[PDB]
Design a binder for this molecule. Sequence first.
Ligand SMILES: [Cl-]
Length: 744
Amino acid sequence: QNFYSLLGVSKTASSREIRQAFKKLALKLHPDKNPNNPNAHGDFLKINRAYEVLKDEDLRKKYDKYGEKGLEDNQGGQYESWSYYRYDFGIYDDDPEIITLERREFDAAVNSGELWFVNFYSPGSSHSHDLAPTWREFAKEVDGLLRIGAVNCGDDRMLCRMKGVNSYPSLFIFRSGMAAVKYNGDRSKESLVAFAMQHVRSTVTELSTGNFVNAIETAFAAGVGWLITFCSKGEDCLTSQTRLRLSGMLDGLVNVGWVDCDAQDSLCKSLDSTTAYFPPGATLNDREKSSVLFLNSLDAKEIYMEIIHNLPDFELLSANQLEDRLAHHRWLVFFHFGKNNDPELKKLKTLLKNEHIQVVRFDCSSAPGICSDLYVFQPSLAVFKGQGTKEYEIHHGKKILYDILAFAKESVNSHVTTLGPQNFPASDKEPWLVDFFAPWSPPSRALLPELRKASTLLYGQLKVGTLDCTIHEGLCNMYNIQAYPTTVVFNQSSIHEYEGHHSAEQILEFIEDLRNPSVVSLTPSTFNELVKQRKHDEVWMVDFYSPWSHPSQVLMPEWKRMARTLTGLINVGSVDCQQYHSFCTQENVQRYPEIRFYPQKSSKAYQYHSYNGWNRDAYSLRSWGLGFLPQASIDLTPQTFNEKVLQGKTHWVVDFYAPWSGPSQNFAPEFELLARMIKGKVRAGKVDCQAYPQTCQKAGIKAYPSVKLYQYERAKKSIWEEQINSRDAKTIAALIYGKLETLQ
Ligand SMILES: [Cl-]
């Protein structure tokens, strides 16, 4: 919509693309840049608000479901300096060979199988600035050899702390098999390369005449061809460093070697300066001439690019082979349709070995029913978990190597199912976590890995599934999905919708709350053990309800909201009288819903109180509940107000009220809660303005109820007076607490 149009990007744009577009606009339009128009702050607000809501995935989701209308105003107001955007912002955003990593995807990325070299840098760090051009250059230098990453510690403090970053910048080498190795050298292009090579697997072998023939003649069965450079004195061939680099770049795909032609003159008479790639089966003799690839270049990247394009495609499996193998080993399958992608992907076979994931392709046209039964209607990449099952997931996003590796290893070790209409849990009492998403949606793709993580911890607790809305438009329409992604738990015919941040931790919290809800569901047994035999200071609110009762159905969502606000204050329970008829009869429950409060055990306490109030919303019920709790405020007089508060030596919070005032009666139980929370820190008082207009006039009270904070400063022997506009006990308290330490 307008925000994407404002930044001039698509609604499918990535975080990086957003930052790129905003950087262009920020450098031209920062209020620092043009001091000649008084509207400079306002013009930048439009762009910065758009940027801040789009870079925030929670905010972005609200903006996709509703326009700016669903958002709230306090955004875009704060921005950094012009110099920040010019020099500290998106430093590696325009450098394609550098992967910009955030906290969520970091571990899965740098452990996906490739050798990673990551620059943990920081804004306001001039050592980080010095490194940047070298890093861009270095990343260009080793393309095809290893993965180069960057992590902005400025926006990723905790990740940098957890990864032992002790200075800016800090350089680490990652590979799944080992612990991080730190580079401590002088940050030069050539030093960084040499360091990385010590961690690169590289086998180059000098070949005798006898060895060369044997390697070439045995190459075919092995499946691996040969890259060989032929060296004569007075002539130039691949250097030692170059052969080792090529060996690393083509690890597991090609054997690298060299031949000393001065030492093998007879052999080199056949050739004629030159490196040759021999596909498996190809020989030097004039028969096998053609398949052999003769190269003249001395440059690794140049040579590599020719080899990588020349290598064979993935093994093609027949329909029979596929069906025989899929439920057992793990299989990464490229699905296509006849017609018979980065060549870099050919490295998947080698780099997935440690996870025993086999890599193949399949031609759906040879068996369309197999692909249509998986709802594969276009070329697709899927990974199957095997081990006796046909669980699979489909890869979404750019078909780039490290991402497909991270996807494949994370998925086969997780418990997220691909859902379709045929196995959708419409009829299931067991708990399900379902993610309705779209592949084109950048947040949706950001969610999938976090879901996989949660799945591993939730195993045995609930099943996790994903549903593709672009494919199954009908299914997501029936669940009223308006934005992507939409995460939803299904538990006992009630369907809860997640609204937190897309991280495994927050998702685990949300589910843990659904597993131990504020509203404690009770049985006839648990009522006796928890409510009846509550300790001599516990209190309970309990809703006795029938699922068949319209009044009960309308109450429950209010009951739950109320329960959430009473955590650590009032125990909240619920009783199903349809299931437990005799018990509810035992308790003399006559109509639904019946709301009862179970007070603190005391000498004069009733067994319980039934709420007969007209209004049954959450606020009314909360205020009713808190009304039974103990008074902690003091009822002040005109004299005691002056002596104890105005001329006292402590902190007060005072409620100026009128008995006839509706709003005052609503607040009274909230004020007592406030009083109890601050007991020992602050004293709480109440002043009847109807009884004492004299004092309320002097104190500056327009209407009722009003709250005033009185702070004592011992240094000046004086009382400070401020007004509290909030009517929320927790809010007021924290607000009061904040001021208190700032004198101590
Ligand atoms: Cl520094």
